[PDB]
Amino acid sequence: MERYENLFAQLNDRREGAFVPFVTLGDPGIEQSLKIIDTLIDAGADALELGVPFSDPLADGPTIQNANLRAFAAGVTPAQCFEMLAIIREKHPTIPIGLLMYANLVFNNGIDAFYARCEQVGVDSVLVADVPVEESAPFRQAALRHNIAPIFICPPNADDDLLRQVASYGRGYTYLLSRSGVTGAENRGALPLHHLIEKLKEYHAAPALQGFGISSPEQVSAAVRAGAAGAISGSAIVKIIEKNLASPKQMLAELRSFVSAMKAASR
Amino acid sequence: MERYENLFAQLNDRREGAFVPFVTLGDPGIEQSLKIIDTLIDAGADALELGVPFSDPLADGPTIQNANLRAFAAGVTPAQCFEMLAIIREKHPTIPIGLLMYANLVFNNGIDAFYARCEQVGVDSVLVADVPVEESAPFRQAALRHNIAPIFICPPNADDDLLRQVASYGRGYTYLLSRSGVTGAENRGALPLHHLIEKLKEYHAAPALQGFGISSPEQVSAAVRAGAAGAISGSAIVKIIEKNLASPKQMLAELRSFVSAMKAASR
Amino acid sequence: TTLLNPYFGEFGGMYVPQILMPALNQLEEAFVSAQKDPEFQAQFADLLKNYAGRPTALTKCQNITAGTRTTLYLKREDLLHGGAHKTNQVLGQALLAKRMGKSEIIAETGAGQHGVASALASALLGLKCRIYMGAKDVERQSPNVFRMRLMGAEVIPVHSGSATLKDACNEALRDWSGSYETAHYMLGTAAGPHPYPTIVREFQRMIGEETKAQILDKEGRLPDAVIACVGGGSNAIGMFADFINDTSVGLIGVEPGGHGIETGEHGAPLKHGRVGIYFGMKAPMMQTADGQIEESYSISAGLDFPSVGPQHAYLNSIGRADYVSITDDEALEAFKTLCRHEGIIPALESSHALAHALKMMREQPEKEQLLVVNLSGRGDKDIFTVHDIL
Amino acid sequence: TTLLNPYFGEFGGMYVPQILMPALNQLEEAFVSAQKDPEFQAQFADLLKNYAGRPTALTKCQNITAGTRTTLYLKREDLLHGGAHKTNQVLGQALLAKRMGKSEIIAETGAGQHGVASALASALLGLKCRIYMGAKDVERQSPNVFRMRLMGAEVIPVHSGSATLKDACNEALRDWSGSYETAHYMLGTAAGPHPYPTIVREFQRMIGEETKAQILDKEGRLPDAVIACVGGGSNAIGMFADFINDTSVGLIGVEPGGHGIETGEHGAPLKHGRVGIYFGMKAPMMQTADGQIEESYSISAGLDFPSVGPQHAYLNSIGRADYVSITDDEALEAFKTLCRHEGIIPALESSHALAHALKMMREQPEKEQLLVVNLSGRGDKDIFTVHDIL
Ligand SMILES: *Cc1c(COP(=O)(O)O)cnc(C)c1O
Ligand SMILES: *Cc1c(COP(=O)(O)O)cnc(C)c1O
Ligand SMILES: O=C[C@H](O)COP(=O)(O)O
Ligand SMILES: O=C[C@H](O)COP(=O)(O)O
C-alpha cells in the first residue's frame, strides 16, 4: 500500500500540511481509546501516530509515562493493541497509521514476526524510538519485506552523514525532532529547522513531520511555513485525556475542539 | 595506740580466733548503718572492717556493689563516713577499726591528709584494695607517720619475695585471701592455706585474718585450725542487710544471730 | 561508526534514541584518548592509591577451609574507600567527564551504593552531581540517601513504573537526552549502551590485575578459578578481565537465585531470563512473555539490575565463563560463616560469591583447588537485614 | 620489679589488687620477648598487611585548604579493616595472648568499636571472646552488639554504677581477677596499669611510622604538626610516637569539649580534670570533688573514656605535646565539611581532630603550615546521630 504517498500528494494539491495526533493505545481503556481515535479522525486528523504500552518508555516525559501507567492499569497488552489496530483499519481504509514503539516490543517475539503482524493489521509505518540508524538494519529490512515504512528521527544535532542516512533509509515520512529532550507539551522547540528541512529535501528524504512539544495552532502553521509537510502532537492530546478522565463525553468534545483547531492551522 | 596487738594478745590468752565482720559505711543509710555496727559489736565482733562508698569498687562482687549503690542512694559521702567513724570510736574505745578503701579516695585530697584524718577519728588500720605492695610506699609511710597500721593482702598466688615484703611492710594484721576473684559469699575458697600461714609466721608478719568467701561457722573454725588468727566476713553480713531492707528490726535480729554463731566458732 | 566494537558476539550495541548518539560517540573517543594518555593514567592511579586505598589486600582464609584441600583467598574490595568496588570506576568516569569539559554528573542507583560512590567522586573532583533513585528504593535506603546529600549531591526520587532501579535508569537517560551538552551520565555497572560495558570493565580491571600479581607472589601460580557475584556485572568483569587469556583459570559468575529459580522470584537473567533490548543494549533480561521488563529479586538489594552486562552473556555463550546462582539462604549462610570464622562482615552481594566457593569446597572436600572470591563489598550495611531474618 | 618503667614521669603505675600483679608481670615479660622475636614481628606484619589492609593511605585535602597556606593530609585509618585504628593493637594483643598460651579474651567497650575489634581478632585467631559493655551503652549501640555476636563473641551487659564504659572497665578487671590463668584482658586504649600504655602505643606506632615515610615521600620534609583526637589516647600516641624525637614536629591532641568546658559537660580530663588513681593508673580523671569517678560527655560516643593515657599526661607536663579541646558543634561542622569537600565521611571522634586543624587554618590563613590529621575512623556509624541533630 502507499498510504503516506497518497496522503502527501492530496495535501500538496490543497497546499495543506498534515496534522497528526499521537495517543497511547488503550489509554485509558480499550473501548474509550477506540472512541478517542475515531474522534481524532472525525475532527480532522490526517494520519495517526500510536504507541503500544511499555514498561520503560525512556523517550517519554511524564504526560506519556502516565498514559502508559493508565493503559497498564487497564491491563492493556501488545496483542490487544494489535486487535485494536485491525479494528481501526477496518473502519478507516486510507488514513496512514504509524506506530511509535520501543525496541523490546519489536524484538520480543522476533523482528520479522512483528513487522508481519503490522502488515496483517494494516499499519503503514513504524518508528522504533531506541533504535538509532546505526542499529537499524534488521528493523528496516524487516519493515520493507512487509510493506511497512521504517521511520527515522532527524535530531537537531544531526550532521550531514546522518541526514544522508536518514534520507536514504527512511520511507513514508521523516520524524523531524523539534528539540532535544523527551516528549512533553510543556517544552517547546524554538530552534530554526529550515536548514535541516532543506537538506532533507535536497537528499530526497521522505516528507518531514515535525514532532515533540507541538501543542498549539501557531506551531502547526510555523512548521508548515518552514517547509515541513506537517506536524505531530502527542502530549497535548494526551493531556486532554488525563484532565478529563472522569467525564468521557467531555473528553471527546475537548479532543474534537483541539484537533479541529490544530488541523485548521495546517491549511 | 596498739589496739590490734592488745586484741590478739587477749584472744591468744583465751585460745580464740578473731571474728571480724565487714560492712559498707552508710548502707542502707547513716542511722541504720550505725545501729548495724553496734549490733555487730554487741553480738561478739572482735574488730571491724569498714568500707567507704566508692563509684568503682573493682575488687567487689555484686553483693558489695549493691551495698555501695544503696549508700549512694542515701547520699553517703566520705566526709559523712569520717563523722560516723568518730562516733563509732566514741562509743567503743578498744575495738580495732580497720578501713578497706579504694585508692582514689585515699589519694584525692592528699595521702598524708587521709591518714591524718583516720588518726583523728580513731581508725587503727587501712587496707587500700588497688594498691599492691609495689606501689605502696607513700601509703605505708603516711600510715606509719599517723599511727595507722598499713594492711597488705597475701594472695594465694604469692611467691616468697611477696611473703617477705608483706611480712616486712604490714602491721596490725595480714589479710590472707581465701582465693582469687572478688568479694562474695557465694564463692568459697578451698585451697589449703597452711603453708602461707606458716611462712608468714616464720617471717614475723602481722597475725593473719582470712578473708573472701567466709560465710559459715565451719569456715571460721577451719581458718583458726589452719593457724590464722581469725577470719573476716563481709558479703555474708551484707546479704543479711540486703534481704531485710524492709524490716530494720528483723535485720538487726538476724545480724545478731549470725555474728553470734560466727563468733562462737572462733572459740 | 565507532572506534571500538560495540558488540560482544550478538550482545551489546547502542540502542538509544538518535539524539544520544553524539554523546556516546564523544564518550568513546574521550575514553580511547584517555587510555593512551600517560597524564590521565597517572592521575587515575594517584586517586586510586592515595584516595581510594589501592591496592587492596588478598586475604587467605584458612579457618574456613580447614579439613579440606581447598585454599581460598578473598580479594578485599570491602576495604576500598566507600566499602565496595564501585569507587574504582566512578573515579575514572569522573576524570573522563572532566576531560570532556563537563561539570555535571547524572547517575542512577538501586540500593544506593552507586549513588554514594558517584557523590563521593563528584565531591572530590568538583562536579555537580544529581542522582536518580526509584522512590521505593529511596524509602528503604534512607542511610545511603543521607550520605549522598551530606556529600552534596541532589537525590531525585523516581515514581514512574515500578519505582525501583530500572525506572531510575530510564529517568537518568531521559535527563541526559536533554542535558548531554553539560552533563556526563555516570552509569553504575558494566552494561548499558557502548561504550559503557567497555569503559566500566577497563576502570575495574585493576581488581583482576592486582589479584594475579598477589596470587603469583603468595602461591607461585594462577588460581584454578576466580568467583564473583553478578548484579550488572562490574565487579565480576573487573576480576575476570586480566585472566580471560589465561585459559586454565576458571571464571565463575554468581547471579542471585532469590527464593529459588523454580519460584520465579530470582535475579538470574543470564541463565534464566530471555534476550531483549533495553537500557541501550541487547542482553538477557528479566521480562514477561509479552516483553515488559520486570524486576530482579534478591535478599541483597544491590544484585537488583534486571539484566546483565553483554560481555558476560558473550563469555557464557562461548563457554569461557560459567554462570551459576545462589539462593538467599545460601548467601545468608555464607555471610554468617565469614563473620564467625574470619572476622570479616561481607556484603550480602559478595556473600553470593563466597556461598558458591563454599559449595565447591564442601561438595568435593578432597579436590585440590586454589580459589579466589572477589569480596566486592563490606556488609555493615546488611546487619539489620540479617538480624531481622534471623 | 619490672623490666620496663611503669611510669611516664608521675603518671602511670600498676594500681591493681595484688592478685593481678602476676598477670601484669607475665604480660610485660611476654611483650618484651615478642618485641625481640623476628617470627612474632613477621606474623604481626603479615596480619596487618594481608588481613587488615596496611599500609593505609595518606590523603592530601586540597579542596579543604584552597585559598590558604595550609597543606593538610589525612592519615586514613578509616580505611583499616573494621573502620578504625583499634584493629591494629587488638591483632598484636591477640598474638601476645597466644604467645602466653591463653585461649580466652576479655575486653571492655563503650561505643562498641573496641568490642567489634576484639571480636574480629578473636574470630580470626581462634580465641574465645567475652565482652563487657555498660547496659546503657548496650541499649544505644545495638548494631555493634549484633556485629560482636555475629563474630562469635559473648556480650555481657553491665548494670552496676553508671552502666557505661567505666563500669565495664571495672567488670572486666573483676573477671580477670579470677580467670587470669586462662584469659588475657584485651584492654581498649593506651591507659590502665602498666604494661598496657606501653604495649598499646607500640602496637599502634605504625600509624606514625607510615605517616613519616609517606610525608617525606610526598613533601620531602616532616609535618609542622600532627593532630589526633584523645578519648583514651591510643590513636593519638600511635600517630605521635615516631615523631617524639623530631623536636620540630608539633604534637597536638584534641579532647572533646562537649557542650563547652564552662558547662562542665565535656570529656577533657587531661586539661580540665584532676589527677586521681583509677583503672590501674595515676592519671588526670573526670571526678567529683570528693573523688568519685564521673563520665566523660561528648557527641561522639567513642571519646567516652573518663581519664586519659598516662603518656599523654607526661608529654603535656613537659611541654612536648599540646592538648586542646573541640566542642560538639565544632566537630559536627568538621564532619559536614569533610563529607562535602572531600567525599570522606569521618568518625565523629576523628572530626574533633579535623575541627582543630580547620581552626589552625582559618584563624591564620596566611600562615604556611603542613599538617597531618589522624583520621582515626570512618563515620558511616554516625550518620543517624548527625541526621537527628540536623
Ligand atoms: C553494586 C554492588 C554489586 C553489584 O554490581 P556489579 O556491577 O554486578 O558488581 C556487587 N557487590 C557490591 C558490594 C556492590 O556494591
Ligand atoms: C575508640 C576510637 C577513638 C578513641 O580512642 P583512642 O584510644 O583515644 O584512640 C578515636 N577514634 C576512633 C575512630 C575510635 O574508634
Ligand atoms: O510522536 C509522539 C510524541 O508523543 C510527540 O511529542 P509530544 O508528546 O512532545 O507532542
Ligand atoms: O574484707 C571484706 C571483704 O568484703 C570480705 O570478703 P567477702 O565479702 O567475700 O566476705
Ligand code: NA
Ligand atoms: Na542482573
Ligand code: NA
Ligand atoms: Na578521656
